[PDB]
Amino acid sequence: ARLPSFAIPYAIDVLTTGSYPRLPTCIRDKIIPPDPITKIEKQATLHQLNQILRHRLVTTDLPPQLANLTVANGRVKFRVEGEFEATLTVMGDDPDVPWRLLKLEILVEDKETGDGRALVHSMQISFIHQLVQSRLFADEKPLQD
């Protein structure tokens, strides 16, 4: 005979925005991988990463020799014009995250000694990628090393 209480917040979650946040998210988290990152949020996070990268570069003793830097899209683009291209990027906060070595490239080229092919195979470039990533994880003044 008695009529139980009307449970309005569930109905507010129905009729305003037609879904149900109220269920344990362990269903969706355990079964389904998370949603892929869209646009907008990408541009905002890249802009914040550009600002954090500027402020992290002005503190560290950057190599002042020929490394002209462009914060272009969260990637500092350390490029000496003669020989070498580096792209660096921090992951988290400003103080304590190390650097990631997103793309390393060697600009030195002669199309005759290297027999019409690249001077250095991607195997060796990836090896130097691991070595410089390790010496970044040594956490000295990193850019000089």
Binding site: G114, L119, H121, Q124, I128, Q130, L131, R135, F137
Partner: peptide, 25 residues
Amino acid sequence: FSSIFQRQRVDALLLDLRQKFPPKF
């Protein structure tokens, strides 16, 4: 239901890079 055969010299240079700059975990 390659390798252009000038990689011996690059590899020796890699070993010299390993010695002159060691990896650091």
